[PDB]
RNA sequence: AGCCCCGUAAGGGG
């Protein structure tokens, strides 16, 4: 029950573009085989990188060999890039784990999340850019239950979606440039579940850990909703 | 009919403290109006601000009776010393000539122009009460409901139920920028300070006028819980 | 994140 976030370190002028990255990824999916992956990209010009998250084993085993085979090779992610390395560790945004390990802990009443790219949500046939507890966490829990081994008990789900508040928020909305008339939140938000039982706190820490892989909200396949947990 | 926001230009050092400022204000009401301390919905809002050495305090009144019964005492404070936490001398009592001073009427809140958009600046920490817990994210419904509720409470008109639905259920966020800051109440919490542009899509012009009115009302009523302490001070921007 | 009270339980008052 492995999960993986593979970082492609890129050599080339310019920066990767979401439509190119997604289309390029879809090519590999056609060749090689709710979304069980997510995409991202980041860094500055000349120090850019792309990332592929894989949320189910079938996909890791299918795609990972195929990302490795591109080391040293030139791909198009908008502009042309030389993939200098495929990283599973040694990059802040690269990692590998298992589902059970998401439940490591320690359990905490608080969950600090950094939103590294514009995050928004589909709601009432509209894109909403505010990182409200219930959105962040329903989104995370929906995917974790979809690809993980556990279904949250109903009381726990209730606690997370109906009870979690915000302790602190810091940030701003930015344009989502692939979209018409859509903004997304960037910055930091610390969520707090009061009266959290140990189990609830555990589930909350797990959702926080899963965010790093699955990301948060809508159009993660375009690199939106890229998030990670912090101390 | 009338809304008024009077600003006390303060002399002395530091800033007013929330609990001291509210203490001071209920001190003044104890003689004219001891009923309001226990009323679940406040016919007023307090505020303070400024750099240190240029501090000011704010008394906002949402019903005429209080203005009548309170304004004279307030004006009488010119020249004299008040305790708003730290002691200050009251230098002036302004209705005009200060950014947070003003007067208007309820009808005049509704004189447009009506906009599908309402940009609010939250100038002091803004937060809300939900399930015995504090929530500092200014969601469309939380803000507009708190404005609308108090408009209906103290004002001459209630919005049609479809306009209410449009405002509450279908208004969204177009832009948000800011951060939470500490907020001392009877219990310590935090609240949002910064700027949010709200947008009601498919708004009828009526709805669009009610939205602009709520925006205008915010200047006197502030937003959310504990405006009695100076929290939720806000105003509409362009 | 916690006390008291209120509350077509949404949110409010101290
Ligand atoms: K009161």
Automatic annotation (TrEMBL), chain A:
Flavoprotein keyword on record: no
Molecular-function annotations in GO: endonuclease activity; hydrolase activity, acting on ester bonds
Single Gene Ontology BP annotation: defense response to virus
CRISPR-associated protein Cas6 C-terminal domain segment(s): 113-226
Keywords: Antiviral defense, Endonuclease, Hydrolase, Nuclease
Keyword Hydrolase: yes
NCBIfam families: cas_cas6
Protein known as: CRISPR-associated protein Cas6 C-terminal domain-containing protein
Organism: Thermus thermophilus (strain ATCC 27634 / DSM 579 / HB8)
């Amino acid at each position: 029950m492995v999960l993986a976030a593979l970082v492609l370190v890129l050599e080339g002028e310019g920066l990767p573009e979401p439509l190119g990255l997604r289309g390029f990824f879809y090519g590999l999916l056609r060749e090689v085989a709710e979304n069980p992956f997510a995409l991202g990209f980041g860094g500055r010009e000349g120090a850019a990188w792309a990332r592929v998250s894989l949320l189910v084993e079938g996909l890791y085993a299918r795609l990972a060999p195929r990302l490795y085979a591109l080391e040293g090779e030139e791909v198009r992610l908008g502009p042309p890039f030389r993939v200098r390395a495929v990283l599973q560790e040694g990059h802040p945004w690269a990692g590998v784990s298992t589902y059970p390990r998401l439940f490591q802990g320690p359990p905490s009443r608080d969950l600090a999340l950094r939103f590294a790219s514009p995050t928004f949500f589909r709601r009432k046939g509209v894109h909403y850019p505010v990182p409200e507890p219930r959105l962040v966490l329903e989104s995370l829990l929906r995917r974790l239950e979809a690809f993980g081994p556990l279904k949250a008990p109903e009381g726990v789900r209730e606690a997370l979606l109906e009870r979690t508040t915000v302790r602190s928020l810091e940030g701003r909305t930015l344009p989502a440039r692939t979209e018409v008339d859509t903004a997304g939140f960037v910055g930091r938000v610390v969520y707090h579940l009061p009266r959290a039982t140990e189990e609830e706190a555990l589930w909350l820490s797990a959702l926080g850990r899963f965010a790093f892989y699955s990301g948060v909200g809508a159009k993660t396949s375009l690199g939106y909703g890229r998030a990670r947990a912090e101390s």
